Symmetry: D3
Subunit: 245 residues, 6 copies
């Protein structure tokens, strides 16, 4: 299937990573490494639409679920990105119910939305059944409106954006601050109460256990670019010390 919704329906825990190096070989390396899904990032990333389409094919061929984080311009991106075969979309900076309802309208065929049309009904039904509609909650407005957001029919999942939330709170990068963690904990509790999925971005491995015990199944473990830099820089420094004795 390559359906995230299907994986979650079995009781599985699933692990992903952000892709911010828009190269199909990176998608294949991530798949080879054992990830269940990859979030191809298009918000910040310099990435051509035809490149994005290539990355989704790479994901499909490599048997990893392609999830896409789109830009703010959902009236342009969502139709294109779903027609390319993204199995899920993440919309950044979701702040209110009206935006979530619009995302659903754009993402789902009748009767669940009005996704543009471009057996037919069976294919539409299957699309609606398996697509993941995911909202980033990463500013104070979104945390405050979480109860109204979480109850929108068709919204499947919320992902915590602690970094941008910290800046929204006037404490950028203080993601360990009780303010940030209490807001994230609140987001989870409300999401969970409305029978929706929460996606954690655990800082450290131990945080996975802490979340898992409360019933979280979905985990994004950082981003490729960050992990690669940290590994290559550490590895090289160690090499240069060992070489000089």
């Amino acid at each position: 299937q390559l359906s995230l919704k299907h994986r979650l329906n079995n009781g599985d825990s699933v692990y992903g990573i952000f892709n911010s190096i828009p190269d199909p070989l990176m998608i294949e390396v991530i798949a080879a490494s054992g990830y269940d899904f990859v979030v191809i990032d298009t918000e910040h990333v310099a990435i051509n639409d035809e490149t994005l389409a290539h990355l989704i094919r790479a994901a499909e061929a490599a048997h990893i679920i392609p999830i896409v984080r789109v830009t703010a311009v959902i009236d342009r991106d969502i139709i294109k990105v779903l027609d390319m075969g993204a199995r899920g979309i993440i919309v950044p900076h979701v702040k209110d119910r009206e935006t979530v309802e619009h995302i659903v309208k754009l993402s789902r065929y009748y009767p669940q939305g009005l996704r543009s049309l471009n057996p037919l009904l069976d294919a539409m039904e299957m699309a609606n059944e398996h697509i993941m509609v995911i909202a980033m909650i990463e500013d104070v407005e979104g945390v405050m409106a979480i109860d109204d957001i979480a109850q929108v029919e068709g919204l499947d999942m919320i992902v915590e954006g602690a970094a941008d939330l910290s800046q929204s709170l006037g404490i950028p990068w203080q993601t360990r601050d009780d303010q940030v963690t209490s807001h994230v904990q609140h987001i989870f509790e409300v999401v969970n109460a409305h029978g929706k999925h929460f996606c954690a971005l655990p800082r450290e491995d131990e945080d996975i256990a802490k979340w898992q015990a409360q019933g979280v199944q979905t985990f994004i473990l950082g981003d490729d670019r960050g992990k690669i830099y940290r590994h290559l820089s550490a590895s090289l420094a160690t090499s240069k010390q060992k070489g000089d004795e």
Copy 2:
């Protein structure tokens, strides 16, 4: 300068890595990680000429020396790759003196070669002074012809290709075999006797010290794709174990 030849002339040890993911962000990540040079691979890699040109610019902007491994088709590649600004070229499967002399002809302006023309003389002189002409020695023929290869004026450096050498010897991937290591040791001794540079591909960090003690200054520490897969796969497995307690 961004000249490998200049770095070596000071007594420096220099560290590089193969790039086989043809994305400018990878070049920038490699530079950020602390590498002195990057060998952008075009032999095996699916990589457009315009992409290669972009990667060399990324290297320049990120202050890392761009070295390029070209394909077998040197009469096409060398002129293009030098005009793009590669500071060094690696030619694969160098087997005889005649090939080395042809590489030099293609890589160097008069009076050192006949590099196509496309103050003028001063620029030509500076190009010749700083370019690194590098031959891969990776088959039995090349090891056997090493004395004739190493004495070609204009050949700056030899790089060991233990993997392909092992297959040439009918023992593919037995790179730890005494046959392979003795041939590589021979290559070094002959290269060094003719006052040329040797570039090691050490298997492990300890091998850097062993080579450095014999006067080797240049080291390629694997390739990005391999390191990334090994790190991401190890990291994820550890994460999944820690999450489940």
Copy 3:
């Protein structure tokens, strides 16, 4: 000229097709096949702006009129797409008069609009004279607002979108339903009353005659991708039966 407006002014019937495979060879194949115009689709299609520019050049070189269906983001797309040389634009999901007036503002130079400036006046005049401004009418809102839409000075043509209209009516793909056909017939009558052009998407060849008799001159006969799949799949099935006797 390669002007659709010019062709229509002679009494010609003109035939087009949607292009949803963004390759210049497809544009050339469509031109070779005898089409008068091609609607290069960018709404749903994964297509780079530089690719689109290439397709328009292919059209020009192949002597086929390039019409472009843009995305919803007209404040971005229209200026780019006209400067690339599109001879007409189709805007999707036109729902009100205010949108049509904005399209005209963006598409036409003074005195007919405020198309960005980037003999000069003569070139502007010629652009305004020959550009086709085309609105898709494909949701109930647009059909209801058709009288207000059709009378906007500078709107040249309306195209029926029966598929998306059917979903808007809560009967997706029931394009043969009397609801859908009566609305499309209404759209035509109102458009025609205001002296504007109607563009039909006939389901079958016989529908061309039916429309032509009422004075329709413009016909889009499906899309390349759909026709190709249907032909290749039918052709192959026939081949496999004939081969096995």
Copy 4:
């Protein structure tokens, strides 16, 4: 598997088509249409290496076997094209045994060749087992040298090139001439005697039965570009006649 060699080993007949429109959507349309394999053409076609890599991924994701026809420059193309994941290669204008032996050297790992190295041995073995090495026989020299060509260990299949053969015979496009057909029949008989596969390019559906009865299993049914032009041009002409009554 997506292995042509595997399909042939079961007694299957397999059907392919040339792709000369280098767009991943065309690969997907060909797969949807029911073809078992696609021959992505790079000999004549303007196609970037990164595009080719994308087309092979499209094929994999769409569950169609990707075969690639390379250029004459096998010392460049073969290593790249195999590393991209082509399941078979077609080399044009094969004229002698020496060329076939070189193709095998480039295409197969030790002990069957010397394909560059870039469990390890198991992966090499699997590659060798499943790769199809295919020679185009399309000039008089190649037909004359067919016995020496066909007996090269590692050559899997020969494909008839009647068009270019006709020009080689000084009768370009006279592919129905007894000269051309007798030479093609000879090629088959010799290939078949040496236990190798023959690939037919039948002119018409009836030719499939004629070949199949002699034990031919592999059929290339034209090329996408040609079929599309012929269908679109015929379809449009019929539409325009029906519209005018």
Copy 5:
């Protein structure tokens, strides 16, 4: 630094040009020619995001300051364009204070805005310190709202758009008209009163002196495409006359 803000802080006059041919060699030619900055145009230009990223790298490698004119869709473009390394952004058709404040929000990290997060604080601070936020004033609305626009904290510079202003005034291309010049003079006086920078687009060389005497330091001298056409066309005409005696 490659900081325009830094250059202006020394008392320097700085010279730029619009780039509307999106090729990295053009960026390099502009740098070689002696320009201090280049305004890479994306408003009108057909230019892929990955191409734009390449042009910015070309600028960095060639030691020319990259400034980017974005499209109207600032909620998409600004984050991408800053993360690519643009040292300044120009937003077209700035008409009110609310838009300027939004540009600042998008362009600057806390505490000066809410630029998305993607030592950390030091890097943010350095970004804010060196970025140039630039508004195009090119319609009557913007001239009328200039006092409210100019006093927005975080707006660094205004650039005159005489061409589009002339069309806004109903006199397209009458850029020499007293209406246009008096409005531009007003824009400068108000901008200058609020301690902000003005960027002139002088028609002729003599206009540079006239502006410089009033304290203007920043000058855009046309666009590459226009200059190239005018030079090549003049040069060729002269050549053809000289050849025929």
Copy 6:
């Protein structure tokens, strides 16, 4: 027609320029400037095959004759470049008769060559009739073999390469030296004696008259990149002096 051969058959003088900035807007600017032909350079230039195809379409759409200078790898390039629609090819560093005969074989259909096949005969005939086969003479070997080169049936034109010839003579860039000019004069006389066309690269406008008087009709007036740099650098220096009074 867009046939250089046709233009020359009327008694016209024709003017071209090298394109070494591989952007379709540059092709269009060159066409707008009044050039009869453009030599799209692929020898030195970083240029994707799909880009080259785009540039040829740009040329066709802009009504300028596209001529292509290929790389040394004629067995790869010529078939691709002709199928893309180049109206002429320039092969660099032509040194002997055997190479010219091979170029002709690759460039012309039966009976004039064996150009790969990919009314039919009429199209082949028209191709042969209008294609220009052009050899660069730019090394001492080629000048020495000029009589044998010039008499090859199917070779249409020779172009002088004074720059590379000077380096071949051990006097790189001494293109004004009597050695270089006497060799170029010899090339012309021999070419002209065999009824073939000569293409001059005049240093200065006055050289056009000198060549024209001897019956030369074809002139390449430099390259875009060089002219642009020289104009932009001169123009900017003048601007900066005028601004400072």
